[PDB]
Design a protein around this ligand. Structure first.
Ligand SMILES: O=c1[nH]c(-c2ccccc2Cl)nc2c1oc1ccc(Br)cc12
Length: 274
């Protein structure tokens, strides 16, 4: 072991995330991303389907890791004195949905439907694996511009999925459901549907619908862009004040607006010039 194995490129970003660097597996030049998370700053630990102390992020990543390209793969990880180092895949070329939206503005419905569909499949995948992501949002989605495939990233606020209530949250507040803001409780799935509601609004209008606590609590959605009535209908549904008034993933995917999505390949051809 040890990082004579990878060649550390430029810093790609930093935050509550820690710091992510571009990398190249020296073995075969596979593009990779090297995430460093400091121990002091990690609140949630778990332990491996073998038993040694790791951050939950790595548990979660290990549970979702597979052939499915809809969630970033964990390639490997190391422990250091005050940090863990995660080696993740890196699509190339790549752009995060935030930058993409910053740069191209409100997305056309055709494009948002394909992107949104792929997010749905990704999140469903996580749920099939027992992992709840807890921070679904445009900065946590990567676009593989060549294949037109979205990848979900950053499980550093995830949890194991369960059917009982959550009384802790450390995702993004502006994407968090009203029940979180008032009572500090939420159930997982329905809280994801709320953030998917925010996400689809973000895509189709170019920005999140709510900045403030009272706007979330109120949950009146105003539309700043031209958006089809069906789209609005689905957005408003996801953003129902009462959790159980929200659609299941199956109801979302069978919604009229989600009909006849482009394959990811056709998506890149049409909308990404690839
Ligand atoms: O977990 C991540 N957080 C972040 C992230 C997000 C927002 C702000 C700062 C960082 Cl480090 N980026 C990535 C993360 O995993 C990645 C895998 C491949 C590539 Br390319 C990028 C990432």
């Amino acid at each position: 072991p040890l990082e004579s194995q990878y060649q550390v490129g430029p810093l790609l970003g930093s935050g509550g995330s820690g710091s992510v660097y571009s990398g190249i597996r020296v073995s075969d030049n596979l593009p990779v991303a090297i995430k460093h998370v400091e121990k002091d700053r990690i609140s949630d630990w778990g332990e491996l389907p073998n038993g040694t102390r790791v951050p939950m992020e790595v548990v979660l990543l290990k549970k979702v890791s597979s052939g499915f390209s809809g969630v970033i793969r964990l390639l490997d990880w190391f422990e250091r004195p005050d940090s863990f180092v995660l080696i993740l895949e890196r699509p190339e070329p790549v752009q995060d949905l935030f930058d993409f939206i910053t740069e191209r503005g409100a997305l056309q419905e055709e494009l948002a439907r394909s992107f949104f569909w792929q997010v749905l499949e990704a999140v469903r995948h996580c749920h099939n694996c027992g992992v709840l992501h807890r921070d679904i949002k445009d900065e946590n989605i990567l676009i593989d511009l060549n294949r037109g495939e979205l990848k979900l990233i950053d499980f550093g606020s995830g949890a194991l999925l369960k059917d009982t209530v959550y009384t802790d949250f450390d995702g993004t507040r502006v994407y968090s459901p009203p029940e979180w803001i008032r009572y500090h409780r939420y159930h997982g799935r329905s809280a994801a549907v709320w953030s998917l509601g925010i996400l689809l609004y973000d895509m189709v209008c170019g920005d999140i619908p709510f900045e403030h606590d009272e706007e979330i609590i109120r949950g009146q959605v105003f539309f700043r862009q031209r958006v089809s009535s069906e789209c609005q209908h689905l957005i408003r549904w996801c953003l129902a004040l009462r959790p159980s008034d929200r659609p299941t993933f199956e109801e979302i995917q069978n919604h009229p607006w989600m009909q006849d999505v482009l394959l990811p390949q056709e998506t890149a051809e049409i909308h990404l010039h690839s």
